[PDB]
Design a protein around this ligand. Structure first.
Ligand SMILES: [Cl-]
Ligand code: NA
Lengths: 80, 81
């Protein structure tokens, strides 16, 4: 529950490492399925899960992007 | 009855994938160059690619998404000192 202290310079360095990671992963991200579960779009695709089926560092970018798609596209479209 | 536009799965997926490719392209240009902590939440700042009048553009959306993701994940790990 407790967090670690960090300074501005070190935090920005790690933040920028995350951005570069996301940029890398995004080249492989593709929505391959969508349903509308109750007025909410849910996009599906390859989450880059590990061999045991668990999310990886790489998966985080997929969850973020698919949530963004649901959030934005659900406001303008309904699936027929 | 509704206020969204109807769309089929094929067209919807094409549109979602274009958004993904667009975010991919913009991310090449994204860098967090500032951070503060406000009411316990980290706030990252940098170039939002605002238009000449200071308003968000389509390109800006990728930055807002990425910086929110950073605030959400890093605030749970760290606090700024
Ligand atoms: Cl309809
Ligand atoms: Na925190």
């Amino acid at each position: 529950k407790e967090t670690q202290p960090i300074d501005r310079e070190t935090l920005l360095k790690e933040a920028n490492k995350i951005i570069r990671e996301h940029e890398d992963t995004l080249a492989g991200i593709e929505a391959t399925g969508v349903t509308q579960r109750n007025g909410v779009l849910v996009f599906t695709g390859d989450y880059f899960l590990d061999e045991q089926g668990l999310p990886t560092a790489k998966s985080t970018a997929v969850f973020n992007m698919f949530k963004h798609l649901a959030h934005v596209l659900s406001e303008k479209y309904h699936l027929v």
